[PDB]
Design a protein around this ligand. Structure first.
Ligand SMILES: Nc1ncnc2c1ncn2[C@@H]1O[C@@H]2COP(=O)(O)O[C@H]3[C@@H](O)[C@H](n4cnc5c(N)ncnc54)O[C@@H]3COP(=O)(O)O[C@H]2[C@H]1O
Ligand SMILES: Nc1ncnc2c1ncn2[C@@H]1O[C@@H]2COP(=O)(O)O[C@H]3[C@@H](O)[C@H](n4cnc5c(N)ncnc54)O[C@@H]3COP(=O)(O)O[C@H]2[C@H]1O
Ligand SMILES: CCCCCCCCCCCCO[C@@H]1O[C@H](CO)[C@@H](O[C@H]2O[C@H](CO)[C@@H](O)[C@H](O)[C@H]2O)[C@H](O)[C@H]1O
Ligand SMILES: CCCCCCCCCCCCO[C@@H]1O[C@H](CO)[C@@H](O[C@H]2O[C@H](CO)[C@@H](O)[C@H](O)[C@H]2O)[C@H](O)[C@H]1O
Ligand SMILES: CCCCCCCCCCCCO[C@@H]1O[C@H](CO)[C@@H](O[C@H]2O[C@H](CO)[C@@H](O)[C@H](O)[C@H]2O)[C@H](O)[C@H]1O
Ligand SMILES: CCCCCCCCCCCCO[C@@H]1O[C@H](CO)[C@@H](O[C@H]2O[C@H](CO)[C@@H](O)[C@H](O)[C@H]2O)[C@H](O)[C@H]1O
Ligand SMILES: CCCCCCCCCCCCO[C@@H]1O[C@H](CO)[C@@H](O[C@H]2O[C@H](CO)[C@@H](O)[C@H](O)[C@H]2O)[C@H](O)[C@H]1O
Ligand SMILES: CCCCCCCCCCCCO[C@@H]1O[C@H](CO)[C@@H](O[C@H]2O[C@H](CO)[C@@H](O)[C@H](O)[C@H]2O)[C@H](O)[C@H]1O
Ligand SMILES: CCCCCCCCCCCCO[C@@H]1O[C@H](CO)[C@@H](O[C@H]2O[C@H](CO)[C@@H](O)[C@H](O)[C@H]2O)[C@H](O)[C@H]1O
Ligand SMILES: [K+]
Ligand SMILES: [K+]
Lengths: 572, 572
């Protein structure tokens, strides 16, 4: 259960070092708006990205040591920056998860269509299909499938880089007009979408070896080095071959095809890239609940997320995350180019907030060597904020959804916090002992003389006396037959048959319950209803059974403050 | 509650006579594939459609008399053709409802964009938005809004027809190569999508005046005459002005603009058409549950639909119908042209089955004048089957989804029927009285000393003795504080504190429940758990509260055959 360095790197790096499939492509797409001759500018810009990457790693190398409990960006932003910055970081992490699912799936389908161009008319269905698949694979459960594909991806891309560099060596500057500083910055910001998951390792510190902090930091350093090597090699290869971004083929696919030649090696590369992107999406799915629990300990998210041991909130979280990702995929049509700016925003707001909190914490404490750590975090935060500002300013026509999504989730967090605050305020205070109860009348609603009915009557009689059976009859003809059949049973239970012409079920019970509750209140008795819970071993018969019980519970019995037992009954 | 003829026509005709907005358009679109000079062929084809319409009306004029209880196509296909034809009719009616929602909404948005061309880039969002709106308006409840717009539509289109005919009179043959018989039949089949809701009146016979059959038949005849007049007038006007189908404007919009001139009259026409199409979609929504109940009486659909008086199944039905319609809208991009063939298939399978059943019933009985009724139904069935065959053969690339949807729903119906058959078989048989119970031990899970906890303890003590409180503690530190606070309460209840390191909640309860259940079984006691049901008056705090209770119920207590009371507690 204590992952070693290699296995931990495999399980947690599938999000970060899987972004090399669409980073250099973004850089080249932005540069191509001027001319194909500007592609050499990818070489410096890429270097700048690595510089940023270095800062991030160093910054997070601090965070892991400062917060060995885990937490990550949310905790750092909460403790050191207050409550609103922490909530903003949480919302941005939610956007990060939704967008990493969407972007990873879209890029995977782009890789697949590059492998088989005949599916270019099904970019969106395939994508959505894949999403649903992993949703199921997360509802069903779910460890080897998350560890080998990353090794395969790293090995395959290292082989591809080596072969491409060898071919370039065997042969198998220049300023260009139009490139202004602003467009260079735009390209750099778009290319910073290669640093889209270095967060993950800092969020899973406990699942490490005996020293958790040291092992996590060394794993993060190794992952950073691997990502830097892969990204630099891919960018160098792309510059070497030219490889302008085609509208129906990824840059990696073009590089592989011009290197190996659409043979088994190329298909291996494409399949492995698709697999690693799917694993990245699954990483987003699996990383959401950790954030949910971290928020829920502070009463910002439902208490149902605080039970982490039983995966209480995993179903709702997985369903909501999958549906949000599907909605985003449909909205942008699976265009990885049009989705990446939003993903970068959702990733870089937490980066900025986390580095700012780190810097202010260092300022507050001022330990030995505080100046260097402060400088590193400050530089990282400045660069990240610049990238975020550029992404807002330029690609607003695809970043508009975050400007709507952030206020909604922040307000939801505040509303939940206020609600739990009020509830905890007025519930903790204890009070006087309630009115005495001298007995209990049990009402058993019956839909027909069955085995389940007789079992429930038996338990009701065991529980207390005064048991009365109640039957709402939709037709006056079957009243006599049902009453006779009940009399055939030798139960000493008074049966009250009451009629409803309009096939309604609540209102006749409303009247009867009024009468019975008044009568019981005269004798200080507590009315109580005993429903059977028919259970079958199919998990899809739930809609087929005992729904009238839920109707009566929800619409009548909760409003009347009446105990409602639910005796289960299994089916063979 | 007993609708008069006029009000009934208004409430039920919003589906049938709202199809004039896209029938002549389909005829013209099919004819335009040859040349604009072939548009005169719309005049004969339209006439043929009316002939078909006449048959349908006559056929249904019989059905209303033969089945005054209602039912409609499903009952006719069930009694006279067997079980599988009845199920096929039911599935096709489900497709009819989904497609009428989708098509009506799409045509409404087409009318809106014709009114304001600036929204042509939002055909699908607007559409989906409208759908969601009516979904809400069907979950909230929902009678005058369903009665006046139909009157407005009829009046407005009658005015438009009169004005257009007047202008044609004041002036304000010719065989064409390429028109083969097959293409004429294709155009006729596509134009038969004007008869897309004459079914509705036959499905709501009881809600009429003192003679239900006569009043329903006369209302159906009046609606048929109105539809014939509107459709014929629209087709004549379209032929008179030429009005080739533009890619960004409905034929009705073109007719109105060339008649009135984009003034307040034209905007009134467009708005009224949009309103009538929205009402048609709402008619589909409201008509689904009648089919659901009719199926459920025969154990083909969940029993939860048999309680028609309390609208038990309306929530699930509305949600599923809305989501299916939204999926179809997105799939075909709100192209009313591409959706109509599927709608016509889903409407005409029931027409064919119903007329065939009517004919065979007449053959079996052979009453006076049987020959004429048999001939009418036979002719209607033959024409409908021909139209359906043509729609399958030609427009397969948009009718493929029904070929997938039909087997799934038919198999679901059969599976549900088999399941209820087995359950009813093995449940009715009564058996020996179960083991005696000599008392009851009550387990009260507590999450902290609160008012709710003390109320639940009070009720548990009232219910029986041997009450024991149980607390799972996620941290050993707060164990002592919680135990001391419990001791501060003077409850004579033994508190068992048990610890779970991984924040799990089921497993410690699993062990404790094993021990307690064994101990109680030694004394023939029945274990029982008492949960509080925290209730707030906001309907959206449901996710915020008492979810651990649902976790414990679902994952632990149903599997152990243990009674689980649920005492409600209201919030102030
Ligand atoms: N003959 C049969 N064929 C198929 N399934 C059968 C069946 N008899 C019982 N069941 C299954 O058992 C569930 C509970 O049956 P019971 O009548 O004990 O429990 C009923 C009864 O306690 C009460 N209830 C239902 N209809 C009622 C009525 N018309 N009048 C009074 N109480 C009614 O609500 C509970 C829920 O009933 P619901 O029908 O939702 O759920 C039923 C159904 O799922
Ligand atoms: N201080 C507070 N702040 C905000 N809301 C509060 C609150 N105290 C109680 N509530 C509300 O009351 C519900 C039931 O509280 P109770 O502890 O009686 O009912 C609990 C208790 O009977 C049992 N349970 C929950 N956690 C437990 C634990 N750690 N150990 C043992 N039983 C537990 O499951 C029931 C469901 O509890 P859940 O927390 O889902 O739902 C809670 C929550 O919605
Ligand atoms: C809950 C309320 C909050 C807001 C409501 C929810 C959103 C409402 C409208 C959203 C959709 C409107 O916008 C609709 O979708 C996208 C917008 O990105 C457009 O489509 C375009 O999206 C982006 C833009 O380059 C591309 O990736 C895509 O290929 C392109 O087709 C559609 O042509 C437009 O019709
Ligand atoms: C059971 C698992 C299998 C999955 C089942 C679900 C199937 C998919 C559900 C609906 C998918 C909708 O797919 C929708 O199709 C429309 C056309 O109708 C596509 O159509 C559009 O695609 C993009 C823009 O978005 C353009 O390149 C293309 O020219 C345009 O036609 C949209 O890209 C997609 O949003
Ligand atoms: C509660 C508040 C609600 C929030 C806002 C509600 C709706 C907001 C959705 C905004 C629409 C998205 O904006 C979307 O942008 C893309 C380009 O990026 C447009 O895409 C379009 O560009 C041009 C210019 O219109 C079109 O001619 C072309 O057909 C298409 O590619 C979509 O037509 C537009 O819909
Ligand atoms: C339990 C599920 C069982 C399997 C379900 C059946 C599988 C269905 C596969 C869905 C494939 C999606 O199909 C996708 O949309 C339609 C099919 O109508 C095709 O294209 C169609 O819609 C497009 C896009 O709106 C329109 O231009 C036009 O109406 C038509 O060409 C798309 O080119 C195809 O990409
Ligand atoms: C709160 C109520 C408001 C509704 C909120 C929901 C907003 C809508 C959710 C996503 C809608 C998706 O809208 C999707 O946009 C894509 C482009 O991205 C559209 O794009 C496509 O439209 C059709 C083909 O389908 C072509 O005419 C168009 O050229 C093409 O771009 C698809 O038609 C539509 O399937
Ligand atoms: C159980 C699994 C069920 C089978 C799974 C697949 C179900 C059927 C989906 C495949 C057919 C999709 O439906 C079909 O999509 C193709 C591909 O866009 C569309 O094809 C049309 O548009 C595309 C896109 O421009 C053109 O390339 C093509 O030449 C043209 O014919 C058809 O108009 C649509 O009818
Ligand atoms: C337009 C497309 C046409 C409509 C789509 C196709 C409709 C028909 C396809 C479904 C046919 C189902 O075929 C049905 O399968 C169910 C599954 O248990 C079984 O149905 C059988 O159920 C049990 C025995 O098991 C018998 O009580 C019942 O009388 C019998 O019908 C039989 O195998 C067959 O009756
Ligand atoms: K990534
Ligand atoms: K219609």
């Amino acid at each position: 259960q204590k992952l070693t360095k290699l296995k931990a790197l495999a399980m947690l790096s599938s999000d970060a070092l899987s972004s090399v499939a669409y980073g250099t492509e973004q850089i080249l797409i932005i540069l191509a708006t001027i001319s194909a001759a500007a592609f050499w500018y990818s070489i410096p810009i890429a270097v700048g990205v690595l510089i940023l990457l270095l800062a991030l790693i160093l910054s997070y190398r601090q965070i892991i040591y400062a917060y060995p409990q885990g937490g990550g960006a949310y905790i750092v932003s909460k403790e050191n920056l207050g409550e609103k910055p922490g909530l903003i970081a949480g919302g941005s992490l939610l956007v990060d998860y939704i967008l990493t699912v969407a972007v990873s799936i879209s890029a995977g389908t782009d890789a697949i269509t590059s492998a088989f161009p005949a599916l270019h008319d099904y970019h969106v269905p395939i994508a959505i299909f894949l999403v649903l698949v992993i949703m199921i694979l997360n509802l069903r459960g779910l460890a080897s499938i998350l560890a080998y594909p990353v090794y395969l991806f790293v090995v395959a891309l290292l082989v591809l880089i080596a072969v491409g560099l060898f071919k370039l060596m065997t042969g198998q500057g220049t300023p260009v007009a139009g490139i202004t500083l602003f467009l260079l910055l735009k390209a750099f910001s778009s290319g910073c979408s290669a640093l889209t998951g270095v967060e993950a390792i800092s969020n899973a510190i406990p699942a490490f070896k005996n020293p958790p902090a040291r092992n996590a930091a060394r794993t993060l350093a190794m992952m950073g080095i691997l990502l830097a090597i892969l990204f630099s090699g891919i960018t160098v290869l792309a510059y070497g071959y030219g490889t302008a971004p085609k509208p129906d083929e990824t840059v990696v696919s073009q590089i592989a095809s011009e290197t190996f030649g659409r043979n088994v090696f190329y298909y291996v590369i494409q399949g492995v890239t698709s697999l690693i992107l799917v694993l990245a999406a699954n990483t987003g799915f699996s990383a959401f609940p950790q954030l949910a629990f971290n928020l829920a300990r502070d009463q910002y998210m439902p208490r149902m997320f605080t039970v982490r041991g039983d995966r209480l909130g995993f179903s709702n979280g997985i369903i909501f995350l999958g549906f949000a990702s599907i909605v985003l995929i449909i909205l942008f049509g699976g265009q990885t180019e049009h989705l990446i700016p939003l993903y970068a925003v959702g990733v870089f707001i937490p980066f900025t907030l986390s580095q700012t909190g780190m810097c202010m914490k260092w300022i507050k404490q001022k330990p030995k060597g505080w100046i260097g750590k402060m400088l590193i975090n400050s530089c990282g935060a400045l660069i990240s904020f610049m990238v975020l500002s550029i992404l807002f300013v330029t690609k607003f026509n695809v970043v508009w959804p975050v400007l709507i999504f952030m206020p909604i989730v922040v307000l939801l967090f505040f509303a939940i916090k206020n609600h739990y605050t009020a509830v905890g305020e007025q519930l903790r205070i204890v009070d006087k002992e309630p009115e005495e109860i001298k007995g209990t009348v049990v009402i058993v609603p019956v839909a027909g003389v069955t085995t389940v009915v007789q079992k429930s009557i038996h338990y009701a009689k065991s529980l207390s006396d005064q048991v009365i059976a109640v039957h709402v009859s939709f037709d006056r003809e079957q009243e006599k037959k049902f009453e006779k059949r009940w009399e055939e049973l030798n139960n000493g239970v008074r049966l009250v048959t009451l009629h409803s012409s309009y096939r309604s079920l609540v209102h006749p019970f409303d009247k009867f319950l009024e009468t019975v509750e008044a009568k019981a209140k005269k004798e200080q008795f507590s009315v109580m209803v005993l429903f059977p819970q028919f259970i079958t071993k199919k998990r899809w018969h739930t809609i087929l059974h005992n729904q009238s019980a839920f109707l009566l519970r929800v619409r009548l019995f909760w409003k009347k403050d009446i105990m409602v037992a639910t005796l289960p009954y299994h089916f063979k």
